[PDB]
Coordinates of N, CA, C and O in Angstrom, one line a residue:
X1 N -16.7 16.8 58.4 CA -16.6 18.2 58.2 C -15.6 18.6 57.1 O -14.4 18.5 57.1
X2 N -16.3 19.0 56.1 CA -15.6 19.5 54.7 C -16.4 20.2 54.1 O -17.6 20.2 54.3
X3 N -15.4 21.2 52.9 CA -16.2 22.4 52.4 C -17.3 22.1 51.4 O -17.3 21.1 50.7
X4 N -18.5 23.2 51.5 CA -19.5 22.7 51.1 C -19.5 22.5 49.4 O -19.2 23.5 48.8
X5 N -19.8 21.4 48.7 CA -19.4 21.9 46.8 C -20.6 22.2 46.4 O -21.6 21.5 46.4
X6 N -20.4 23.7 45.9 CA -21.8 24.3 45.0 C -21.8 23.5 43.1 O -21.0 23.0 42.4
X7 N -22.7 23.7 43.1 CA -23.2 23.3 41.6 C -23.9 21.8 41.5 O -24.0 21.0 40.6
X8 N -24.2 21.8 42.5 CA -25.0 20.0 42.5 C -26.6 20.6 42.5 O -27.2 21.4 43.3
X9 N -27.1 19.6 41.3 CA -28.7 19.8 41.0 C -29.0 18.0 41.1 O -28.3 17.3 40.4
X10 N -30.0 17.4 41.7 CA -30.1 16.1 41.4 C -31.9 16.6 41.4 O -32.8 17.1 42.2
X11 N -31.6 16.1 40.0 CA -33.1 15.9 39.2 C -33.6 14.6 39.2 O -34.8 14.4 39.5
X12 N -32.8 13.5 39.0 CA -33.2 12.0 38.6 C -32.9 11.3 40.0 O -31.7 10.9 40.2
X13 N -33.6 11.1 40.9 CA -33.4 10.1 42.1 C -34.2 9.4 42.6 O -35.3 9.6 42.0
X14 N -34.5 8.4 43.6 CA -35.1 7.2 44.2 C -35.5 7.4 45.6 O -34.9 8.2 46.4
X15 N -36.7 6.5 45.9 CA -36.7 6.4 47.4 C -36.9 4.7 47.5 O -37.7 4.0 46.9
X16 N -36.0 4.3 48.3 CA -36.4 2.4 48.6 C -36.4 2.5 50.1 O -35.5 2.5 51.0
X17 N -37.7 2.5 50.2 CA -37.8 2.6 52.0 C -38.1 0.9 52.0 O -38.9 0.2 51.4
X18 N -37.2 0.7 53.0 CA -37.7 -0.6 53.6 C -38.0 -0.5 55.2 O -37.4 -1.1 56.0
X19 N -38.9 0.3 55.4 CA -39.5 0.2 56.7 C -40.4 0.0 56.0 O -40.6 0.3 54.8
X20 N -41.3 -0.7 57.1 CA -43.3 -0.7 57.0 C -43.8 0.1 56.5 O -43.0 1.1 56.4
X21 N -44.7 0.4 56.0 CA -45.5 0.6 55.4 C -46.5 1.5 56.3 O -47.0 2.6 56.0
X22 N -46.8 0.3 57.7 CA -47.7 0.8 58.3 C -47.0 1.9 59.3 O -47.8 2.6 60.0
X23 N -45.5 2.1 59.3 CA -44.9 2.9 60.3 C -44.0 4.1 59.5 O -43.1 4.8 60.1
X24 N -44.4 4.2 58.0 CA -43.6 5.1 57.8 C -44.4 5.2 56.5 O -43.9 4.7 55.5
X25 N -45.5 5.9 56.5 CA -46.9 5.9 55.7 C -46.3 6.6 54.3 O -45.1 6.8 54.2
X26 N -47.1 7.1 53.2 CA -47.0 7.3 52.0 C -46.9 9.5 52.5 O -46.2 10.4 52.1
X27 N -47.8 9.6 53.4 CA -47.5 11.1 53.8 C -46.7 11.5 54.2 O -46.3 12.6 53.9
X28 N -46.0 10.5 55.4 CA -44.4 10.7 55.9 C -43.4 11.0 54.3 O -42.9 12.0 53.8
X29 N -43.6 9.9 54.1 CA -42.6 10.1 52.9 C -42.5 11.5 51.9 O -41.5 12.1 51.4
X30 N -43.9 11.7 51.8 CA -43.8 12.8 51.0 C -44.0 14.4 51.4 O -43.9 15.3 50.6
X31 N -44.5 14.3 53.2 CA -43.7 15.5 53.8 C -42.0 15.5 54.2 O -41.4 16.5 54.6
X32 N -41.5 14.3 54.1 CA -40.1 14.3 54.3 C -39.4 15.0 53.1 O -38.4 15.7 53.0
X33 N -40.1 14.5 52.1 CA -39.3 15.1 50.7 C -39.2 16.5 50.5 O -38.3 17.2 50.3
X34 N -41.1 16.7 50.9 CA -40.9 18.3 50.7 C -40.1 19.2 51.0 O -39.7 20.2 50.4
X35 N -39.7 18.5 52.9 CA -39.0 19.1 53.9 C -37.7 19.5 53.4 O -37.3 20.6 53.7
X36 N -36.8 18.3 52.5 CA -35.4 18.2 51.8 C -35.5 18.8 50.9 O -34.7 19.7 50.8
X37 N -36.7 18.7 49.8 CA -36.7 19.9 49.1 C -36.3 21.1 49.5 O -35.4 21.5 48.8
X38 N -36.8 21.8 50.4 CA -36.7 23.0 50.7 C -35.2 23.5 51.2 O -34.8 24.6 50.8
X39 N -34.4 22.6 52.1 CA -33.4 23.1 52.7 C -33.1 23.1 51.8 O -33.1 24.2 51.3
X40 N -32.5 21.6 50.8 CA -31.4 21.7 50.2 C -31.4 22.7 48.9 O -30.4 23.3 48.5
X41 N -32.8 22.7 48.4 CA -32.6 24.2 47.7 C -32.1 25.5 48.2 O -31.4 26.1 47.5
X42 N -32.4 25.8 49.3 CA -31.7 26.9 50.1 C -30.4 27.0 50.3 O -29.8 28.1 50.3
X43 N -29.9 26.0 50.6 CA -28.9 25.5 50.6 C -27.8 25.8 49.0 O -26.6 26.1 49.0
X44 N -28.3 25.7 48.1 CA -28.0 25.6 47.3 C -27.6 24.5 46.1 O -27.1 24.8 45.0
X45 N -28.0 23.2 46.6 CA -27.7 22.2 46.4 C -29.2 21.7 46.2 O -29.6 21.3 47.3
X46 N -30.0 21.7 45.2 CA -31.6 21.6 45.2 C -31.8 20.2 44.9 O -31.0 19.6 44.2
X47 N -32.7 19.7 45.3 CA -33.3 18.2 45.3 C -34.5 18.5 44.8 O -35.3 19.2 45.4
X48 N -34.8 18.0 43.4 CA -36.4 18.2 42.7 C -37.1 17.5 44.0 O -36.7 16.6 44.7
X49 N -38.2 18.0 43.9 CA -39.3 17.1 44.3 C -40.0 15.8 44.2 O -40.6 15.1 45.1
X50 N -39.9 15.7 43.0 CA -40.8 14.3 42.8 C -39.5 13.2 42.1 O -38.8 13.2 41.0
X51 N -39.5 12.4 43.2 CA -38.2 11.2 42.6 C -39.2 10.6 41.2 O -40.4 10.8 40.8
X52 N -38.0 9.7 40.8 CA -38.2 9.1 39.7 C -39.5 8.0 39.8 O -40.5 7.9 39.0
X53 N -39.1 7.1 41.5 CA -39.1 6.1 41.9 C -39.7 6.0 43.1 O -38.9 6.7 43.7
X54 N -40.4 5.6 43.9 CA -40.9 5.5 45.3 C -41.4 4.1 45.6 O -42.5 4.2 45.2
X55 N -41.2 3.1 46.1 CA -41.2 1.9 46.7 C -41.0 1.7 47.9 O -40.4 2.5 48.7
X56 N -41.5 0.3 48.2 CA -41.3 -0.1 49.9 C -40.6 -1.7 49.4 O -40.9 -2.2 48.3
X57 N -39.7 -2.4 50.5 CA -39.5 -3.0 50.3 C -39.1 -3.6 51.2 O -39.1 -2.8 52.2
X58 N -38.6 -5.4 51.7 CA -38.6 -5.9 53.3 C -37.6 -6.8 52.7 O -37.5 -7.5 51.7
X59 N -36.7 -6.5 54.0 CA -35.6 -7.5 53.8 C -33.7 -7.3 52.8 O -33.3 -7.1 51.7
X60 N -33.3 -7.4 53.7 CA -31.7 -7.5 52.5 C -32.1 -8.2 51.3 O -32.6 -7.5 50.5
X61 N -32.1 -9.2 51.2 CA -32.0 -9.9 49.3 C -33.2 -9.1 48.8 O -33.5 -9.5 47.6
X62 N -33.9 -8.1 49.2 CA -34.9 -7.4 48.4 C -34.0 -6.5 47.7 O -34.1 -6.3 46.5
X63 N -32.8 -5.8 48.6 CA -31.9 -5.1 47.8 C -31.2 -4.7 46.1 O -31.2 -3.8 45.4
X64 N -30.6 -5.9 46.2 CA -29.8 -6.1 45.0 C -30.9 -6.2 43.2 O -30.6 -5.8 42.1
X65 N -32.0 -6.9 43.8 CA -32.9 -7.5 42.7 C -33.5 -5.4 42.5 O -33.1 -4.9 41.5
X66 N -34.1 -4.8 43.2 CA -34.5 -3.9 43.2 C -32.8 -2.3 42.8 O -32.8 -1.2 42.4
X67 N -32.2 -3.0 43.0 CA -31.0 -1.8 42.9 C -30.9 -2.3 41.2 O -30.9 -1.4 40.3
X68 N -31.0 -3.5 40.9 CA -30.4 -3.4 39.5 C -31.8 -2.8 38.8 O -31.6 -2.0 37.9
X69 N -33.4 -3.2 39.0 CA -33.8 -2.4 38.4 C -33.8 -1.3 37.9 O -33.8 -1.0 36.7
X70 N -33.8 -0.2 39.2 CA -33.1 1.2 39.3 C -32.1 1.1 38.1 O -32.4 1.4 37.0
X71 N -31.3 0.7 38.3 CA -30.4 0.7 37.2 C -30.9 0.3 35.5 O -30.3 0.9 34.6
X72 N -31.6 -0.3 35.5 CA -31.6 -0.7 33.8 C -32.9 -0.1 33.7 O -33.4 -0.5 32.7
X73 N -33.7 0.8 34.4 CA -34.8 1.6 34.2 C -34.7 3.0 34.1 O -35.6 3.5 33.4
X74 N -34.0 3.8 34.5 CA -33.9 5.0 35.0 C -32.4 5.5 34.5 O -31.4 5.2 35.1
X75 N -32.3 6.4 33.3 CA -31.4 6.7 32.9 C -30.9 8.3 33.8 O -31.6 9.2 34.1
X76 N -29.5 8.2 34.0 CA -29.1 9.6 34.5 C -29.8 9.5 36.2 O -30.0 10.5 36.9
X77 N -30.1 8.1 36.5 CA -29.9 8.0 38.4 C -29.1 8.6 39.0 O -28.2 7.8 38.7
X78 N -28.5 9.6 39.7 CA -27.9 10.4 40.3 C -28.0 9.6 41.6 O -27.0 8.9 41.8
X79 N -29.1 9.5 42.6 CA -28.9 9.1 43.7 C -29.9 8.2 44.5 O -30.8 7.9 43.6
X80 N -30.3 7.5 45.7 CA -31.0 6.7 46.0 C -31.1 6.8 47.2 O -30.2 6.2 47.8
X81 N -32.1 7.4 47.9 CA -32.3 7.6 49.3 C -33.0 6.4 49.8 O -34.2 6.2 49.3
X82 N -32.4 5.5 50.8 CA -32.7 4.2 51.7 C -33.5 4.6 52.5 O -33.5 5.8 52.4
X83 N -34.2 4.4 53.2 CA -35.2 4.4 54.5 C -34.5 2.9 55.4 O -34.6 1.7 55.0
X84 N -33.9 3.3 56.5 CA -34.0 1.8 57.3 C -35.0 1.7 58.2 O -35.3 2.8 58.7
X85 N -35.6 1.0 58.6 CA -36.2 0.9 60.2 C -35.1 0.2 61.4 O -35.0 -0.9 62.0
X86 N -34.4 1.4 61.5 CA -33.3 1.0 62.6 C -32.3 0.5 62.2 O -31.7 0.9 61.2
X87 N -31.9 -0.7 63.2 CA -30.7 -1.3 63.2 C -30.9 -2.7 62.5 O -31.6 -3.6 63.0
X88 N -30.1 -2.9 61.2 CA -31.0 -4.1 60.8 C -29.6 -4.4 59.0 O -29.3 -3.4 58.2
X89 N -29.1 -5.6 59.0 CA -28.8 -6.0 57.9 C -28.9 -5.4 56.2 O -28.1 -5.7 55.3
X90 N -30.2 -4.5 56.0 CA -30.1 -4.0 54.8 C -29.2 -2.7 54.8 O -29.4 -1.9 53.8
X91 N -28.3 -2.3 55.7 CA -27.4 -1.3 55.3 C -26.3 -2.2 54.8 O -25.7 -1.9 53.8
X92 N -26.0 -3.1 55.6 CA -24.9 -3.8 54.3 C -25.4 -4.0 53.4 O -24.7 -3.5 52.6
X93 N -26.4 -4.4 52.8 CA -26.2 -5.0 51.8 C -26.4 -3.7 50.8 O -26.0 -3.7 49.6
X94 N -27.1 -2.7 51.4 CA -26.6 -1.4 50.6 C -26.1 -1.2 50.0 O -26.2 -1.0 48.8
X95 N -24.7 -1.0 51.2 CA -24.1 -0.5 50.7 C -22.6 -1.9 49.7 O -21.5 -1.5 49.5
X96 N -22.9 -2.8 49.5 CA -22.6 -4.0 49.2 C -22.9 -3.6 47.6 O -22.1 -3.2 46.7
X97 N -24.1 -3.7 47.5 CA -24.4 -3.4 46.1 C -24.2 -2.0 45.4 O -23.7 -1.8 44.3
X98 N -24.7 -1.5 46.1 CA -24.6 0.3 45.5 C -22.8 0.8 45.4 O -22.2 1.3 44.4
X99 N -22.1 0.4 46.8 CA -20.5 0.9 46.5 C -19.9 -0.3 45.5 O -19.6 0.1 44.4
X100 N -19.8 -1.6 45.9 CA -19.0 -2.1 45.2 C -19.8 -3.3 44.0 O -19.0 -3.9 43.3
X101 N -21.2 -3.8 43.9 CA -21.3 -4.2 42.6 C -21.9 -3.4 41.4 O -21.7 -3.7 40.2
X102 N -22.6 -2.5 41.6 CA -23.3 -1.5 40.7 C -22.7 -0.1 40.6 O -22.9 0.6 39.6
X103 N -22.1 0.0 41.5 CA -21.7 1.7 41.7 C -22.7 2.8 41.2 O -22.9 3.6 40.3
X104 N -23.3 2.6 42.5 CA -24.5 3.7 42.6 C -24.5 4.2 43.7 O -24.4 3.6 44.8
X105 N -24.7 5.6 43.5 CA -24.6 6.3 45.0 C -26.2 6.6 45.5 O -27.3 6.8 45.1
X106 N -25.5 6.4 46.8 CA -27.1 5.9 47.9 C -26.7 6.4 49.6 O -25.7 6.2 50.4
X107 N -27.9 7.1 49.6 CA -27.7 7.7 50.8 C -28.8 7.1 52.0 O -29.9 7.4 51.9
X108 N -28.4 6.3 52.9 CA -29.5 5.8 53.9 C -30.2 7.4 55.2 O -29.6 8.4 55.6
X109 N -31.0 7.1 55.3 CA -31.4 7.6 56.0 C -32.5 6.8 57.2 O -33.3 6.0 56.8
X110 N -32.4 7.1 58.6 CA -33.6 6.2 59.6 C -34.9 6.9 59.6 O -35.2 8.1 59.5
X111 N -35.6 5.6 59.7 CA -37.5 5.5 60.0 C -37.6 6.5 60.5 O -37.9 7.3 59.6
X112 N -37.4 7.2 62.1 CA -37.7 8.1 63.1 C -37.7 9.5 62.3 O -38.6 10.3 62.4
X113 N -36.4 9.6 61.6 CA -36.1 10.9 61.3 C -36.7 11.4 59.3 O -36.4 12.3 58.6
X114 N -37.8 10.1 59.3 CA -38.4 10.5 58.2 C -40.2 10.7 58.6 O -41.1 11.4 58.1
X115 N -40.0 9.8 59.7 CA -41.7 10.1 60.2 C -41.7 11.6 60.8 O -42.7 12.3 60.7
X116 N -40.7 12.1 61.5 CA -40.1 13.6 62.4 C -39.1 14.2 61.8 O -38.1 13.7 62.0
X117 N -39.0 15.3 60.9 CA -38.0 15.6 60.9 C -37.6 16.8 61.2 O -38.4 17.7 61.1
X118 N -36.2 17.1 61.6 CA -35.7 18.4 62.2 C -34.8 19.1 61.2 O -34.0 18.5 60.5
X119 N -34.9 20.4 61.3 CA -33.5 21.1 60.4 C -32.6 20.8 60.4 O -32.0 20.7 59.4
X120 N -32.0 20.3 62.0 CA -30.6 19.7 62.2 C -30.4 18.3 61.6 O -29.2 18.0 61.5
X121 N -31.4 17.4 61.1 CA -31.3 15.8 60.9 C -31.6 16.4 59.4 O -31.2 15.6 58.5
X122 N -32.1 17.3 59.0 CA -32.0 17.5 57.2 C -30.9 17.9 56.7 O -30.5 17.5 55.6
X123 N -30.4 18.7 57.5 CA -28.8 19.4 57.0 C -28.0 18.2 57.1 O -27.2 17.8 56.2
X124 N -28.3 17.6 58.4 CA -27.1 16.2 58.1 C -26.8 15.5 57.2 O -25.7 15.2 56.8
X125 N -28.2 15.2 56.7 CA -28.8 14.6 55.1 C -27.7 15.4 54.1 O -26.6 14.9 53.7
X126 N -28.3 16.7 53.9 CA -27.8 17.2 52.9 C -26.4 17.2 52.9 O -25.9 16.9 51.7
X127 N -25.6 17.5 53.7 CA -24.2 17.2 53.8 C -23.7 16.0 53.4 O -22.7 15.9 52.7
X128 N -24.4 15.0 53.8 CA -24.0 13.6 53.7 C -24.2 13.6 52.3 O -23.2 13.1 51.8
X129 N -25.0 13.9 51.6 CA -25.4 14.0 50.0 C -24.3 14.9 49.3 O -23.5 14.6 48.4
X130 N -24.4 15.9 49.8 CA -22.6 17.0 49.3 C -21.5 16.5 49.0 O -20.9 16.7 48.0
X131 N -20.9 15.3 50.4 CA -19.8 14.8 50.4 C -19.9 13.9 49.4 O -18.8 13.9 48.8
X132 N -20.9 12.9 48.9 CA -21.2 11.8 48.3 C -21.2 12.4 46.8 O -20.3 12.0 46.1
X133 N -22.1 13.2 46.5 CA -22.2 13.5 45.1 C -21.2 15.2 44.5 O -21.3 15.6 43.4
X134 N -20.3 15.8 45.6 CA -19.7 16.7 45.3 C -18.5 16.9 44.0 O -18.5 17.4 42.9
X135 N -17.5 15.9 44.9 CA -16.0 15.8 44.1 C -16.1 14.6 42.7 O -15.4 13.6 42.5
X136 N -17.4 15.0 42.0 CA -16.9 13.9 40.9 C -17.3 14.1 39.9 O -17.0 13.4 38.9

């Protein structure tokens, strides 16, 4: 709980879902975006639409090989939304690579609440995205 920072626009960002494929389909993904789109524009804090980047991916060591591409492809990366499927090893390594070998900011978000999503689990998003890309 902290005050909200206006003037954040992220134009250039990613999605690395490592859930299935078969459980968290290509339409999920891109009614979830829409959905973020919308608050966080409202919000005032706007999330383009169309990431840079959209991928699926299985496993922690898929992590790091896929974070550095992001990196040496994509100039002006601002952020990187995770997909997990639950409780599972690739949030360390997440946040392993993204906070302390690359320094890139990355926000995870879970499977459930990308196949379903609610205003209250988008706003969470967006907040968590505020806090992360606000003060810097």
């Amino acid at each position: 709980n902290k005050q909200f920072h206006t003037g954040i626009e992220i134009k250039v960002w990613a999605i690395a879902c490592f859930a299935p494929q078969r459980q968290c389909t290509e339409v999920h993904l891109k009614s979830f975006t829409e959905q973020l789109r919308k608050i966080s524009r409202d919000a005032g804090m706007p999330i383009q639409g169309q990431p840079c980047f959209c991928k699926y991916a299985q496993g922690a060591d898929s992590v790091e090989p896929m974070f550095r591409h992001l990196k040496n492809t994509y100039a002006g990366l601002q952020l990187v939304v995770v997909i997990l499927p639950g409780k599972t090893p690739v949030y360390a390594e997440v946040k392993r690579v993204g906070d302390t070998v690359l320094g890139m900011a990355t926000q995870c978000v879970q499977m459930k609440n990308v196949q379903r999503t609610t205003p209250q689990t988008l706003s969470n998003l967006c907040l968590k995205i505020n806090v992360k890309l606000g003060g810097v």
